[PDB]
Amino acid sequence: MAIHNQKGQTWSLMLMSLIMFIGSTNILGLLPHSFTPTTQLSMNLGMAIPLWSATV
Amino acid sequence: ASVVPLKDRRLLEVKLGELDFTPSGIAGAFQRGYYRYYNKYVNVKKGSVAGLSMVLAAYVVFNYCRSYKELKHERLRKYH
Amino acid sequence: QFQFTGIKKYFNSYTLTGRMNCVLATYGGIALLVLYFKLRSK
Amino acid sequence: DTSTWFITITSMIMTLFILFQLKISNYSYPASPESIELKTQKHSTPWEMKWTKIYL
Amino acid sequence: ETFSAISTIGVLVYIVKKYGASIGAFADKLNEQKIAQLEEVKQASIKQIQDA
Amino acid sequence: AEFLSLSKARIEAYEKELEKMKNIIPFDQMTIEDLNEVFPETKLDKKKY
């Protein structure tokens, strides 16, 4: 929140949902036989491009 | 069957750790959840281990079933 | 259907730029085709 | 491994961002609560002057 | 090949040590918030009842 | 005559302002909407910090 300080603060309530999902789905997989969805390269090319081109 | 699986999580969550019903989790059923490991995970008082570490112990043995077909390795006997 | 009006004030605010998955969708369709193309020529 | 073909996961990621925008949207904030701390005082403060003009 | 099953369960035992200090933090967390709520119920009554 | 009654309503509204403050919480863990009278809420994009 502190860096932006604009009327671009509306966007920041989403960016803390983005940190809890890949914060969790990278921490679940350390278990014995679990499976991480951020291992496959498919969804990460759907996490970058609909967010990166939402900026330009 | 939707009201059947939805009444599994709701009933289980209240019973396992925390919710005249909110302070029922203040004592907690963590004393009930405690006895499974040995004693050692004692820190469950306000960061509750036995509330969380049962789901993650369920998600491991659920994923042990899919892997079982691939890593067979067993002879015409039993192990040690 | 109340997974809408809790967040419906949010949607038409930022989905004007945020709901541009068309580029994502276009890329995905092309990706499926190339894989099929290489398995067609084996 | 080098997996292939991609028709999978990415359609099952945007259903997840209907969940995470439902949970995290109902979050109590100390800062937000703080901003409701001064709204009760100065209405009653000029209400003290509402009887000061009603008399004088 | 799952002797790394125990070592990912052995490290999660050492964090139960600091979890008995996480409780204090957890207990401390919102004490200010609940107190943060006790200040408004105390200020509003006493500032008005003398004014009346 | 007027100033003893214009202060009386200011005594009466202050007698109603505290009795509504006792209405909000019946317990420490009471409610998430009864505490939503004194401490405020607003429309979209009010709380800057």
Q: What is the end-to-end Cα distance of chain E in Å, rounded?
A: 78
Q: Which domain holds residue B50?
A: 1-80
How many Å apart are CA F13 and CA E48, to the nearest integer?
A: 10
Q: How many CB atoms lie within 10 A of CB E20?
A: 15
Which residues have a Cβ under 8 Å from the Cβ of F41 and sit 6 or more positions away? D32, D36
Determine, for residues A43 and D3 on separate chains, whether the beta-carbon distance falls below 8 Å: no
Q: What separation in angstroms does the CA of D14 have from each of A50, D18, D19?
A: 11, 7, 9
Identify from D44, D50, D52 which residue to disrupt to test chain E contact, counting E C-beta atoms within 10 A and taking the largest count: D44
Q: What span, in angstroms and rounded, lies between the C-alpha atoms of A22 and D16?
A: 12
**F49 close to A (CB below 8 A):** yes
Q: How far is CA E20 from the centre of its chain?
A: 12
Which experimental technique did the depositors report for determining this structure?
cryo-EM
Largest Cα–Cα distance of chain E, in whole Å? 78
For chain B, list the contacting chains (3+ Cβ pairs, <8 Å).
Answer: A, E
Query: Are D39 and F40 in contact (CB < 8 Å)?
Result: yes
Contact at CB, D21 and A17, closer than 8 angstroms: yes
Domains held by chain B: number: 1
Which ranges constitute the DSSP H helices of chain D? 16-23, 31-34, 41-55
From the list C13, C23, C28, the residue facing A53 with the nearest CB is C23
Cα F31 from Cα F28, distance rounded (Å)? 9
* Contact (CB, 8 A) for E29 and D23: no
Using alpha carbons only, give the angle D21, A18, A37 rounded to the nearest 5 degrees.
105
Distance CA F2, CA D52 (A): 12
> What is the spatial distance between Cα E9 and Cα E13, in angstroms, rounded to a whole number?
7
Least CB–CB distance from F3: residue in D35, D36, D55: D55
Q: Three-state secondary structure along A1-56?
A: CCCCCCCCCCCHHHHCHHHHHHHHCCCHHHCCCCCCHHHCHHHHCCCCHHHHCCCC
Contact list in F for residue D48 (CB cut-off 8 A) is: 10
For chain D, the straight-line distance linking the first and the last C-alpha, in angstroms and rounded, comes to 86
Indicate the angle between helix axes A17-24 and D16-23, nearest 10 degrees: 120
Cβ contact F18:D40 at 8 Å: no
Domain-wise residue ranges, chain D: 1-56
Indicate the residue type of B36. R
CA atoms within 13 A on the CB side of C12: 5
Cβ B17 vs Cβ B28: under 8 Å: yes
Distance separating the N- and C-terminal Cα atoms of chain B = 43
Within 8 A of A45 by CB-CB distance, chain C residues are 27
Least Cα distance to B49 among B17, B8, B12 occurs for B17
